[PDB]
Amino acid sequence: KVFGRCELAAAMKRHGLDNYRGYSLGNWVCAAKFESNFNTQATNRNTDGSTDYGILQINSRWWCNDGRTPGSRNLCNIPCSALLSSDITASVNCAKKIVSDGNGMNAWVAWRNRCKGTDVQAWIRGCRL
């Protein structure tokens, strides 16, 4: 599923990401835009052989099982395919564990490089929230 900007903002707010660990909704929308272009089906292989999955490009090295990332963890206790669903519940619940683990949203390379220190509230401007 390819979300609209305001559709994804509403879905993320309903699932508890607005101000989660102090990160305003626009931070999450910005991260999703540059990680996945708001596409739940996005996948990208990493040099180490892990893969990033879904609208927030969550990595099989630590967070999910994809059956082909040897010596990896499954800290969100999910198959990586759950992160590709039109339903963002798995991605959101797994993102809450990631952002809670000490590095905050710096875990998302696209957030650090394209969203951090920018006017992220622009990402929810004009949305009915």
Catalytic residue among 48, 52, 66, 119: 52
Burial 25-34 (b: 16+ CB within 10 A, else e): bbbbbbbbbe
Task: Mark 68-87 with x for binding to Na ion (rule: CB under 5 A) and - for no binding.
Answer: -x--x-x-------------
The amino acid present at 125, given as its one-letter code, is: R
Please identify which residue in 60, 92, 94, 95 interacts with Na ion, judged by CB under 5 A: 60
Angle, helices 25-36/5-14, rounded to nearest 10 degrees: 130
Q: Is 101 annotated as a binding residue?
A: yes
DSSP class of residue 105?
Answer: G
Whether 52 is catalytic is yes
CB of 84 to Na ion, least distance (A): 15
Q: Which residues bind to Na ion, rule: CB under 5 A?
A: 60, 65, 69, 72, 74
